[PDB]
Amino acid sequence: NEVVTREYTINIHKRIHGVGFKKRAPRALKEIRKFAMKEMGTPDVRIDTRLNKAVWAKGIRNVPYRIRVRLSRKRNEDEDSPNKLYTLVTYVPVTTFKNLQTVNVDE
Amino acid sequence: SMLRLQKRLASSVLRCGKKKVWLDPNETNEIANANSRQQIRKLIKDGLIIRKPVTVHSRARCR
Amino acid sequence: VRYSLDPENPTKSCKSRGSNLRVHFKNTRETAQAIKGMHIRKATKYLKDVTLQKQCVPFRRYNGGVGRCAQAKQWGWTQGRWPKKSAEFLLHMLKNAESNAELKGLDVDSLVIEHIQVNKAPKMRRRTYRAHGRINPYMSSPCHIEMILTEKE
Amino acid sequence: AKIKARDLRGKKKEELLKQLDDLKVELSQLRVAKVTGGAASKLSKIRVVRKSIARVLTVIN
Amino acid sequence: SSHKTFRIKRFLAKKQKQNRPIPQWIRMKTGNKIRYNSKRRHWRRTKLGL
Amino acid sequence: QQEQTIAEDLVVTKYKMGGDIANRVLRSLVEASSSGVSVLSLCEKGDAMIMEETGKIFKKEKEMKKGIAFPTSISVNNCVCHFSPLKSDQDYILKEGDLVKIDLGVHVDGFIANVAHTFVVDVAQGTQVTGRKADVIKAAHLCAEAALRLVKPGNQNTQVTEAWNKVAHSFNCTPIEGMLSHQLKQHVIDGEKTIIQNPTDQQKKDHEKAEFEVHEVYAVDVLVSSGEGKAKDAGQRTTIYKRDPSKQYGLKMKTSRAFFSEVERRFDAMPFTLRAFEKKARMGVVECAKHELLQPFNVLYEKEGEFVAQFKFTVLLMPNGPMRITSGPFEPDLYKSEMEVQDAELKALLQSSA
Amino acid sequence: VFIVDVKANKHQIKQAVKKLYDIDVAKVNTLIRPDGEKKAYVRLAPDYDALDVANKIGII
RNA sequence: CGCCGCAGGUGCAGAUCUUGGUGGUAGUAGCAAAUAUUCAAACGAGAACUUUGAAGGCCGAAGUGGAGAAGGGUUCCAUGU
Numbered sequence A: 001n002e003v004v005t006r007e008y009t010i011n012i013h014k015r016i017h018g019v020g021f022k023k024r025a026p027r028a029l030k031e032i033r034k035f036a037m038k039e040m041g042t043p044d045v046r047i048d049t050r051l052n053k054a055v056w057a058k059g060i061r062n063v064p065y066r067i068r069v070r071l072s073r074k075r076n077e078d079e080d081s082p083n084k085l086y087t088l089v090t091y092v093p094v095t096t097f098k099n100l101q102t103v104n105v106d107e
Numbered sequence B: 001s002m003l004r005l006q007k008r009l010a011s012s013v014l015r016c017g018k019k020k021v022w023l024d025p026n027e028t029n030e031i032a033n034a035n036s037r038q039q040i041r042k043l044i045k046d047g048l049i050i051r052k053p054v055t056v057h058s059r060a061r062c063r
Numbered sequence C: 001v002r003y004s005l006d007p008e009n010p011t012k013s014c015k016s017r018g019s020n021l022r023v024h025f026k027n028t029r030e031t032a033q034a035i036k037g038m039h040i041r042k043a044t045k046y047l048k049d050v051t052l053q054k055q056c057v058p059f060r061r062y063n064g065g066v067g068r069c070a071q072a073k074q075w076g077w078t079q080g081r082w083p084k085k086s087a088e089f090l091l092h093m094l095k096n097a098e099s100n101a102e103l104k105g106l107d108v109d110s111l112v113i114e115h116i117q118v119n120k121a122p123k124m125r126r127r128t129y130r131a132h133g134r135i136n137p138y139m140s141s142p143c144h145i146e147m148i149l150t151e152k153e
Numbered sequence D: 001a002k003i004k005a006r007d008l009r010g011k012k013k014e015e016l017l018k019q020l021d022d023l024k025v026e027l028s029q030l031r032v033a034k035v036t037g038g039a040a041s042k043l044s045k046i047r048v049v050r051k052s053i054a055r056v057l058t059v060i061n
Numbered sequence E: 001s002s003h004k005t006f007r008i009k010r011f012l013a014k015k016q017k018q019n020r021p022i023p024q025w026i027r028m029k030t031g032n033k034i035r036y037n038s039k040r041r042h043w044r045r046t047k048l049g050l
Numbered sequence F: 001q002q003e004q005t006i007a008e009d010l011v012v013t014k015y016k017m018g019g020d021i022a023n024r025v026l027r028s029l030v031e032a033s034s035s036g037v038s039v040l041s042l043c044e045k046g047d048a049m050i051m052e053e054t055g056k057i058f059k060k061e062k063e064m065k066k067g068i069a070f071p072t073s074i075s076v077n078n079c080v081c082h083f084s085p086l087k088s089d090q091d092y093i094l095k096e097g098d099l100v101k102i103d104l105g106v107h108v109d110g111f112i113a114n115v116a117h118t119f120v121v122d123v124a125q126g127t128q129v130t131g132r133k134a135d136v137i138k139a140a141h142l143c144a145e146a147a148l149r150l151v152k153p154g155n156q157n158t159q160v161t162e163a164w165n166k167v168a169h170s171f172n173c174t175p176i177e178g179m180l181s182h183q184l185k186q187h188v189i190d191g192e193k194t195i196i197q198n199p200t201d202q203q204k205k206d207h208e209k210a211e212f213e214v215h216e217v218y219a220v221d222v223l224v225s226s227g228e229g230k231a232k233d234a235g236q237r238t239t240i241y242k243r244d245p246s247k248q249y250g251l252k253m254k255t256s257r258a259f260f261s262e263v264e265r266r267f268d269a270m271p272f273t274l275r276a277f278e279k280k281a282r283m284g285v286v287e288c289a290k291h292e293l294l295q296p297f298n299v300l301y302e303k304e305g306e307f308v309a310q311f312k313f314t315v316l317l318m319p320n321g322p323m324r325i326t327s328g329p330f331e332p333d334l335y336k337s338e339m340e341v342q343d344a345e346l347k348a349l350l351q352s353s354a
Numbered sequence G: 001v002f003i004v005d006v007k008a009n010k011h012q013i014k015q016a017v018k019k020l021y022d023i024d025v026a027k028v029n030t031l032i033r034p035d036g037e038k039k040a041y042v043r044l045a046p047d048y049d050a051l052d053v054a055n056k057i058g059i060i
Numbered sequence H: 001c002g003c004c005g006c007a008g009g010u011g012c013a014g015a016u017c018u019u020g021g022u023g024g025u026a027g028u029a030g031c032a033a034a035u036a037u038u039c040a041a042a043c044g045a046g047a048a049c050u051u052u053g054a055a056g057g058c059c060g061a062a063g064u065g066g067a068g069a070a071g072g073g074u075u076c077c078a079u080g081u
C-alpha cells in the first residue's frame, strides 16, 4: 500500500555529530527531511510545526539526541503537482527511547 | 496577501507594538480588506485581531 | 529575420530566436555546444538534468578557473558545470521552437537541433565602488540565441 | 454666440461691468466643472470665456 | 528642514512641479524629436542648488 | 450549479408575468406622455405604477426581492439613453412632434424583462409622420423583426450585427458606435455573453465569438441614429448606476457607506437611479463610483438636431422557436418611409414571423 | 475646501466666500501646499449646511 | 570622375599623443566587520529573501527603542507595475 504510516526514532546525535554550533538545528531538520525521503521514497516531505518546535526546544546547538517521529505517507490528490504522494512527519513525545522499535501504526 | 498596513494600523489602534499584534493566519483575505482604522476596530471586536499578552518576566526569583 | 545557416530546405525545419537575454554569454555558449546535435527530447531531458545537477555541461573554451567534476567524463573533458540560468533559457527557447514546429505542422518527435548559435548582445552598464574613491564598470554580458531544428529519422 | 470688441464699444460702463461679471461667474463655474470631471465641451469653453474676459477688460481700459 | 522660508518653499515647489514625465501625446506631434524628459531629477542622486 | 433556467414552469410563468407587467407600464406611459408634460413627472409615474404592482403581485411570498430591473429612462431627440433627471436638474418639456425613447425593466426573482421602445408623441388622427426620422424608427423595428426571426441556437452573434448594419445602410443611416446587448440570467444584467451593435476594430477585437444556446434569455437591442453614429457627453450629471458585486473596497465615509448599504438593500445588483433617494446620495455616489463599486451609465448625446431611435426586448430561446414577451406599440399604418428594403435575404427574414 | 490665491489672507478669503456664495462662514484655516497653491478650509456658520452649499456650487 | 591649369587645414604606427570603441586577463578576484536562523501556510508563472502564524535568537533603556535641531525636499501615504 501507499497510504502507510509508521513510527521511527531518529538518532539526531549520530546525524548531527561534527556540525558547528550555529547550524546544528537547521542541519537536524535537513537530516530529518533526508531520513523521511530515504524511508518513504517521496521527494515531498512536510515537517510538522510541532516537530520543528521539538527540534528547536533546547536552542540552536543543543539539539536533542533522539527524536521519535511518525511518517505518514499520504496522497497529494488535492492539486496538480509532479509528486503524487507526500510524507508528513509529526512529533511523537516519549519518556524514554529504550527498547523502541520501528512500528507500523494504524490510521 | 500582504498585511503590513493592517499590522501597522492594528498596532496603532490597540496602542501596543507590532510585536503584540496577532492577525489570524486563516482570515487573511478578510483582514486584507481592512484598509481603515475603523475596519481594524471591527476586526478587533470580532476577534480576528488579538493583542497578545506581555511576555512574562517574573520577579519571584528576585523576591 | 536573417538567421545564419539557413536550413537545407525550410519545410522540415523550425526556428527560434531570442535577443538581449540576460544570461551569461560564456555559460550559454558552453550549454549550446553541449546540446548541439541532440534530438529534442534528449536535449530537454539533458537540460533538466543540468538544472538538477545530474548531468553537467563541459566548459571547453571558457574554462579559466572552472572546477572539475565526475560528470565531465561523459564528455571527453575534465571541467564541467551546471548553468541553471542557461539551461532554463535554452529550455524556454526549445519549447518555443517546438510550438513553432506544431504551428508548421511538422512532427516534433523527430526534431533534431541542427543549428544553435549564441552571440554577444550589447553590454549593460552598472557601477562598482573601489578602494580609493574609484569607479569601475559592472557590466552585464547578455546574449542573442538562435536555433534551427530539423526533422530527421 | 461669441462677443466682439466692435459691438462692445457702443455700450456704457455699467453694462460692460455687468458683462464682465457674468463672464467671471461663468469662468468660475467652468473651473468647478474642470475639477469635477466635466466634459470636453466645458473644458474647451474655458479659453473662450477667458478671451471674452480679456476682450471686455481691454475695451473698458 | 521642517523650518523653511516662503522663498525656499516656493523654489522647492517649482522644482517639484517640473519633475514629471513628458505627456505621451507629445511624441505623436509632427517633428517631435523628444523621447523622454532628460531633466528628471531624483532626490537621492542629484541634489538641488539651494 | 444552483442557477434557475427556463426548465421550470414556474420560471416560465413569472417570465410571462414580467413581460405582461412591462408591457402594461409602457402602454400606460405612451398614452400618458403628451404635449406640455415633464420628463420628471413621467419618470416618477413610471416608477410609481411599477412599485405598487410588483408589491401586490406575489403577496403570498414576502422573502424575494422584486421590482425595478432598469429605471425609467426617457431620451427625446437629443439623448441616446440612460437619461433620468432628478428633481434638482432642469426638466425637459415635451413639445409637439417629438420622438421619445422609453426604457424600462422589471425583475422577478432576479430574472429580468427589460424593454425599450421609441414612439412619437401627440400624433393627430389620420395624419402621416414624414421626414428623415420616418426611416430610422422603421429600420429599428425591422431590426427587431430580424433579431426575433434569427435568434436561434446555431446562429452566431456576429450575424445579427451584420444584419443590423445591412438594414441600417439600406435605410441610409447607421447605429451608434459601440453598444452592447447581453445574455440575461438570474441576478445578472451584464452577462459575459455579449452581442455588439455597429462595431469598429477595437470593439471587434475585444468582442467574443459565441453560439446561441438553449434555455437562456437575451436582451437584443437596436439603437440607431440618423446622422453619423457618434456620441459624447455635454457636461450633464450621470443618473444611472449599478452595483458591481465582483469587487469590494472599504468606504471611508459615513454618507457613502449608508448610500451603498441602501443600494444593496433595494437595488442589490440591478441598475437604479439617484431619484430613488438625494442630498446625501449625490455625495455618496462619487466615493462609491471612484473605486468601481458602481458601474455608471453615462448620458450620450448625438449632434444637435439629429434623430435617434431604439427598440429592445427580452427574448427567451426555447428549442422549438423563440417567443417575445415584451412588445412595443408600433403600427405601420401611421408610420411609413420613403425607402424600403432592397435586400432579398432581408425581405425573407422580415416576412417570416416567429 | 478651496484652492485660493497665494496672496490672499484669511480676511480676504472669508469676505470673498461670503460675497460670491451668499453664505456666512465661521473661520478660515489656511495652508500652502507643497506644490505652491494655497488651500483654505472654510468652516461654515452653524445655520448653513456645507453639504447643500457644495451641491449648489456643483462639487459634490 | 578623366585631362590642362590653379589653391591647400593634402598622405601617419609611434608622440606615458586626442576622442571613441574593443580584447586577453576572466566566468577570474571577489559578493568573509558587528552570534542566527527554522517550520507551515497564503498570494503568485516563479519564493532562501514578500506577508501571516509558530519557534529559536539579538539590540538590552549610554538600545538596533520613542521624538527633535541642522541638512535633504516629497523620500511621507495609498493604489498599481
Ligand SMILES: [Mg+2]
Pocket: C064, C065, H028
Ligand atoms: Mg586563473
Ligand SMILES: [Mg+2]
Pocket: none
Ligand atoms: Mg581560486
Ligand SMILES: [Mg+2]
Pocket: C128, C129, C130, C131
Ligand atoms: Mg567596493
Ligand SMILES: [Mg+2]
Pocket: C132, C133
Ligand atoms: Mg569616497
Ligand SMILES: [Mg+2]
Pocket: E044
Ligand atoms: Mg547624499
Ligand SMILES: [Mg+2]
Pocket: G030, G031
Ligand atoms: Mg498656518
Ligand SMILES: [Mg+2]
Pocket: H009
Ligand atoms: Mg594637417
Ligand SMILES: [Mg+2]
Pocket: none
Ligand atoms: Mg593610429
Ligand SMILES: [Mg+2]
Pocket: H014
Ligand atoms: Mg614614424
Ligand SMILES: [Mg+2]
Pocket: none
Ligand atoms: Mg571565485
Ligand SMILES: [Mg+2]
Pocket: H032
Ligand atoms: Mg567571499
Ligand SMILES: [Mg+2]
Pocket: H060
Ligand atoms: Mg541579550
Ligand SMILES: [Mg+2]
Pocket: none
Ligand atoms: Mg531613535
